[PDB]
Design a protein around this ligand. Structure first.
Ligand SMILES: Cc1cc2nc3c(=O)[nH]c(=O)nc-3n(C[C@H](O)[C@H](O)[C@H](O)COP(=O)(O)OP(=O)(O)OC[C@H]3O[C@@H](n4cnc5c(N)ncnc54)[C@H](O)[C@@H]3O)c2cc1C
Ligand SMILES: O=C(O)[C@@H]1CCCO1
Length: 491
């Protein structure tokens, strides 16, 4: 039989969405004054983001000339090209007297393409995929080796940023692959630990590890072999992190691995060599219905094992695959929400739960969403101290938002720390991570995609998720209905 908290997790696995969302709503609701402050801050963060290099203000003036003379796009553009040519006349007197969407962006590296594609064509296609992967993935990778990544840390660390490094690579298929990942992780801990040089788990850099890298065919692995084989590896790495006093974070992956990951964490927290050390980190995904129940479990685990757990709250990286897997298994429901706004509500409710127990949990709020960030900033309350919480972001996505956050108040920043997640590796380790970033950046529901859509007003972009849910409820007839285009698997 399971403990009370473990049993509650299991029972919530595929809770009906009407139920799960209805339950979260009042825990996610910000009191009116807090809601108002969160809105104003979110608005201001998002405004600066958009209007970097005057993107919006330039977009204005354009529309005016593109009307005050009655013209279309190509009309205005043509008029600019001439104006530019006229502006290149040195002397004023002389002047006065006179599938293939991002094909454009792809061209700067260099309907008729459709024929070229049909023509030019599998070893080609496989080669095309590999190079496109590298080209797009570059912006998300901090270095090829941990040494290169680390030798790059000073610039942002001196501004108050922190790092968590990820030696890319996951889902080991063979015993040999898992062993190689083990060696890579170990190597990385030695390097990060030496660089950290005693700065500790808060100020100093840490590492993020995927359990799927450390065990062959983890996706279908049984408890008995995971404990016999994976656990000693997890323990070994964590002991080494502890010797260097750096944080070590256990990544959250597919939802059917949540249970085994909790079993591993439970065992890890009771190792004698880790007594009194608070550097163990664990990620939880707010897009899961189980998330708040996992928090209750974690709170009890911190108490029983006598430590402060580092808990990274994220929304989640595997949503597309989760929906697909659930539709294939034909079960009673989904282990994740089907509307993005419900994940947002879940994240806010879970953030409140984490912030309530600062003796037991150090919350690490991973997000690139300006509203989510502003809400957490307000929910954390008055009298911030550095060890209360931190924000986190992915390299290549979070820096512009967080340049308004980490740093001095005198320089116009919020003075809250952000830990940058820093992937390290060569092209052979990049694929899976890059695909997830493509899904994240390309989704019409994602904040980073919406903020780039200048037709979407700021107020809509940073709209309160709880209010959004209640708006849906008033229109649709009940709270927390599933996405209209995502029926239950058995339907
Ligand atoms: C530093 C860092 C570490 C992370 N570590 C992990 C990890 O170990 N494991 C992991 O799984 N994730 C992890 N993530 C999260 C993941 O990689 C995405 O970055 C994150 O979910 C984006 O959230 P947001 O607040 O930035 O963006 P938003 O645009 O606010 O939120 C986007 C998220 O909404 C969710 N979503 C999208 N569509 C729907 C829908 N129709 N219904 C319900 N939910 C939906 C997805 O989770 C999506 O990522 C991490 C993120 C960061 C910044
Ligand atoms: O691998 C991923 O896509 C997420 C983001 C960082 C770690 O887990």
């Amino acid at each position: 039989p399971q403990s009370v908290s473990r049993a509650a997790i299991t029972a919530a696995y595929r809770r009906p969405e009407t139920e799960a969302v209805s339950m979260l709503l009042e825990q996610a609701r910000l009191p009116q004054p807090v809601a108002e402050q969160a809105h104003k801050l979110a608005y201001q963060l998002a405004d600066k983001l958009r209007n970097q290099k005057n993107a919006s203000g330039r977009a204005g003036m354009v529309q005016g000339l593109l009307q005050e003379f009655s013209l279309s796009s190509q009309e205005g553009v043509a008029l600019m090209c001439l104006a530019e040519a006229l502006l290149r006349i040195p002397d004023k007197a002389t002047r006065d007297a006179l599938l293939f969407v991002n094909a454009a962006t792809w061209g700067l590296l260099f309907a008729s393409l459709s024929r070229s594609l049909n023509r030019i064509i599998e070893p080609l296609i496989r080669k095309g995929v590999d190079m496109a992967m590298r080209l797009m993935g570059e912006q998300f990778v901090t270095g090829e080796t941990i040494a290169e990544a680390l030798a790059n840390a000073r610039k942002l660390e001196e501004k108050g940023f922190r790092y968590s490094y990820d030696m890319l690579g996951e889902a080991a298929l063979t015993a040999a692959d898992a062993q190689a990942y083990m060696v890579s992780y170990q190597q990385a801990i030695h390097a990060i630990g030496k660089a950290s040089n005693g700065r500790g788990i808060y100020e100093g850099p840490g590492i993020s590890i995927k359990l799927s890298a450390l065990h062959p065919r983890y996706s279908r692995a049984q408890y008995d072999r995971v404990m016999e084989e994976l656990y000693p590896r997890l323990k070994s790495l964590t002991l080494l992190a502890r010797q260097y006093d750096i944080g070590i974070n256990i990544a959250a992956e597919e939802s059917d691995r949540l249970e085994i990951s909790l079993d591993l964490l439970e065992k890890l927290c009771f190792e004698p060599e880790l007594a009194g050390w608070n550097g163990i980190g664990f990620v939880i995904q707010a897009y899961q219905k189980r998330c708040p129940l996992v928090i209750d479990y974690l709170i009890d685990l911190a108490t029983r094992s006598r430590r402060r757990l580092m808990i990274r709250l994220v929304k989640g990286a595997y949503w597309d695959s989760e929906i697909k897997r659930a539709q294939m298994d034909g079960l009673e429901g989904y282990p994740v929400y089907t509307r993005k706004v419900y994940t947002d509500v879940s994240y806010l409710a879970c953030a409140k739960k984490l912030l309530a127990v600062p003796n037991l949990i150090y919350p690490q709020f991973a997000t690139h969403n300006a509203h989510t960030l502003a809400a957490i900033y307000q929910l954390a309350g008055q009298n911030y101290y550095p060890g209360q919480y931190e924000f986190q972001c992915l390299h290549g996505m979070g820096e512009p938002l967080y340049e308004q956050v980490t740093g001095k108040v005198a320089d116009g920043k919020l003075n809250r720390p952000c830990r940058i997640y820093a992937p390290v590796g060569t092209h052979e380790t990049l694929l899976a991570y890059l695909v997830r970033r493509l899904l994240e950046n390309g989704a019409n529901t994602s904040f980073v995609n919406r903020i780039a859509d200048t037709s979407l007003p700021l107020d809509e972009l940073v709209a309160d998720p709880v209010t959004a849910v209640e708006k849906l409820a008033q229109q649709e007839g009940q709270t927390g209905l599933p996405h209209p285009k995502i029926p239950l698997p058995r339907d």
